[PDB]
Write a protein that binds this ligand. Structure first.
Ligand SMILES: Cc1cn([C@H]2C[C@H](O)[C@@H](CO)O2)c(=O)[nH]c1=O
Ligand SMILES: Cc1cn([C@H]2C[C@H](O)[C@@H](CO)O2)c(=O)[nH]c1=O
Ligand SMILES: Cc1cn([C@H]2C[C@H](O)[C@@H](CO)O2)c(=O)[nH]c1=O
Ligand SMILES: Cc1cn([C@H]2C[C@H](O)[C@@H](CO)O2)c(=O)[nH]c1=O
Lengths: 440, 440
């Protein structure tokens, strides 16, 4: 039973574990045959001693195989099974476009997502701003949507890398979250359960990012590329900026609106376009729907610009019990805040910094996020019309438009926002939106 | 925006660019306002017309200022901010001893290093063999460490001389890499960003070096010294030998072990010692901590003999979250290969030459480094007990001891080491470890 202690001792002393050892230990996490403190202790030895590529691959494959793994050869799709994952951000709406776009160019995209965690908005909370939108279809409904529409964005079912449930739960109370190979293992366990042929990872950089410094973000990205490819899934990673809000809006309904206007062509945020297109390029190339970058981009502009991508977003929503006509009449269905007013800076000058962590928090404090489950989310609140880094601010140029349920709520977000945007007399250095492509 | 093209035209027609033009062009590279082609054009005219000393100083100060530049004034430190920089080589572990030694004699040494790279292996990879050791403290941590210990070895190069990324990338596809003022600015800027008072540069010479001939090494070294001195940083260079491995080890854990034994005195390879000494001497003198070569050597030798240098390295490991007791107990923490075993030459004779790049590559294939940046390092593997040029070889005197993760890689590394080391019937001549000192 507690032969796990043996596996702990072996790693406490700086020796590599083997597949059977790792497999054993994981399967015991899943089965409850292994104690909490035994998970904590193993976790903390890995934080101190790290892991090697064969360990990392073994740990991911073992957590991935601890629950269901989706099988697609059964349905003879003529294209690649591909997905994308993001360490999260504020305004990180990219998936709502990216799925449809890739589907539009041949990909089959089974996107299992999650809810807002901490200060970052989660995709499922955004899609559930769409009335009747159902993130939990059954196998039949689900496979059919992927076969017909080509993309679906569903919640995490309990059968998905359940070893990770307890593993992460213990990590998060034992100061053992901050370990690249452990992070890499939980992230990839899930995404690989999907049965992928290819994957792209969007690793955020900056004030509103998971990892605090660029090089740590790089480190995680490199690790994920290595392990995922190591696991037999062609994978690339992009390091993308999160030093300001990526969309022009933050929230739930307001982000769904932006996604639709992006796909139809009503409006495209320049920074959001870059990060979105590049991630879409990667999936295409990796899934072999394109030779190089230009053939990828050309095909992706194509479906952006002939309505095919907006069209397939519309079908997906229709498939998952959303409104039939949602793309055409999104304002008919998206909730509206009771109160919508601009907030203005106190000084003149240029925007030099944005505390994105804090903006993310402020949206949660308005009801966009839940502090604890069984909190009902207000889907109408958020920010729109964000000022951006570099921008010149005066009295008639607002920092954002804040959407609140009442004035007390509004005033509080106003304060948060003014506090989180710094202005200098000097216009600052430019920030690229994509920093680095990373490949095997 | 394309005052760029004016600047290209100015340089093209053989004039000297002004500081302000150079600063404008460099920042345009960082912000991406200046096109790749324009960068290529600029580099190629520099390649053709060279640059005056003033232009060289401006170009490297502009790259230095293109990102973060550490300011130490506010800590009122009462010694010099000093560092080493190197063109690098195999078994070049000097930094691990040189930082502790110079700090013990009153210098402050903020070593900021890099990652990835090829045949030669990074300092941060090496330190990361120490469980728990953190190469990414935050700024206040860093200052606190430099303030309290006097040395720290971290890895946050991202916010330093960012202009050089696009610059170098572009140089490297247009055949404009090979220009001494471009090389000088690239090599020197990241290091000048640490805000140094003094600096020594180690330019390797020999088969394993970055410049192919002694002549060219000397040229580069004179350039770097001219520029760094014009940039207000007191600098000298040394030509040091790279025709064989410098230390007796090649790898990570094995090179940390050698470094600690060098400092405690348990073992000091004579060739490594000579180099490490010569470089530490430049640092004390340039940074005004010693009046001449003999006071410096005395001060350095002393902190070796009384374990003070060793103690500084220990406090540094502690301050950067390794074990407090690393120096007394390094064998308890450092990872150990599953298999370690000597390799014997096929024939008998003297070692007459050695392909260091190959040896370096042999270590990488063992997992001791990275072919792909997505690759993960096995810290436990590498070579020890390296035979040296001039050594008599036979069945009782092995080439090296290979530390491998399994017999298959061992057997593989052993062919690599046999092939790399060329024996001869008659002894070769010997050369110095340290060649010319350059003060310009
Ligand atoms: C730290 C950590 C975050 N996450 C986050 C990353 C993503 O932002 C989110 C996906 O729902 O889960 C993990 O899945 N595992 C982890 O170990
Ligand atoms: C048409 C248009 C919409 N928007 C919207 C898109 C999003 O719905 C909103 C989020 O701030 O801003 C602009 O920022 N500029 C525009 O020109
Ligand atoms: C040409 C060139 C090489 N390098 C290489 C030389 C050295 O081998 C290494 C510095 O550690 O990087 C630069 O850093 N900048 C340059 O411009
Ligand atoms: C004591 C001793 C150690 N060493 C070195 C071999 C290894 O490279 C190092 C231990 O890592 O110590 C020698 O080369 N000769 C000696 O006499």
């Amino acid at each position: 039973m507690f032969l796990a202690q043996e596996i702990i001792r072996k790693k406490r002393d700086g020796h590599a574990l083997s597949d059977e050892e790792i497999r054993f230990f994981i399967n015991g996490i899943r089965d409850n045959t292994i104690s909490e403190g035994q998970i904590a202790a193993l976790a903390m030895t890995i934080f101190f001693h790290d892991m090697t590529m064969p360990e990392r691959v073994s740990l991911t494959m073992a957590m991935r195989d601890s629950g269901t793994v989706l099988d697609w050869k059964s349905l003879n799709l003529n294209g690649p099974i591909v997905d994308k994952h993001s360490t999260g951000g504020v305004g990180d709406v990219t998936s709502l476009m990216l799925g449809p776009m890739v589907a539009a160019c041949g990909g089959y995209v089974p996107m299992i997502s999650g809810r807002g965690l901490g200060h970052t908005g989660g995709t499922l909370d955004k899609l559930e701003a769409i009335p009747g939108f159902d993130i939990f279809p059954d196998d039949n409904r689900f496979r059919e949507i992927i076969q017909d529409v080509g993309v679906a964005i569903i919640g995490q079912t309990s059968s998905l890398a359940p070893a990770d449930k307890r593993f992460y739960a213990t990590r998060d109370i034992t100061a053992t979250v901050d370990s690249i190979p452990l992070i890499t293992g939980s992230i990839l366990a899930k995404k690989l359960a999907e049965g992928l042929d290819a994957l792209v990872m969007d690793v955020k950089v900056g004030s509103g990012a998971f990892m605090p410094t660029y090089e740590l973000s790089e480190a995680l990205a490199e690790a994920i590329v290595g392990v995922a490819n190591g696991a037999g899934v062609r994978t690339t990673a992009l390091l993308t900026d999160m030093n300001q809000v990526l969309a022009s809006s933050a929230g739930n309904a307001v982000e769904v609106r932006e996604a639709v206007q992006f796909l139809t062509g009503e409006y495209r945020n320049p920074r959001l376009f870059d990060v979105t297109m590049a991630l879409c390029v990667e999936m295409l190339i990796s899934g072999q729907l394109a030779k190089d970058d230009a053939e990828a981009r050309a095909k992706l502009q194509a479906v952006l610009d002939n309505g095919k991508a907006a069209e397939v977003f519309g079908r997906m929503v229709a498939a998952q019990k959303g409104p039939s006509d949602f793309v055409e009449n999104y304002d008919k269905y998206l909730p509206t805040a009771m109160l919508s007013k601009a907030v203005y800076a106190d000084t003149e000058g240029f925007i030099s910094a944005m505390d994105t962590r804090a903006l993310g928090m402020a949206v949660v404090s308005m009801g966009g996020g839940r502090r604890q489950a069984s909190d009902t989310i207000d889907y109408s609140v958020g920010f729109t019309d964000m000022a951006r880094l570099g921008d010149s601010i005066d009295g008639q140029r607002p920092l954002a438009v804040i959407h609140a349920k009442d004035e007390a709520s509004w005033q509080e977000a106003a304060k948060a926002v003014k506090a989180a945007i710094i202005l200098d007399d000097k216009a600052p250095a430019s920030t690229p939106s994509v920093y680095r492509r990373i490949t095997e």
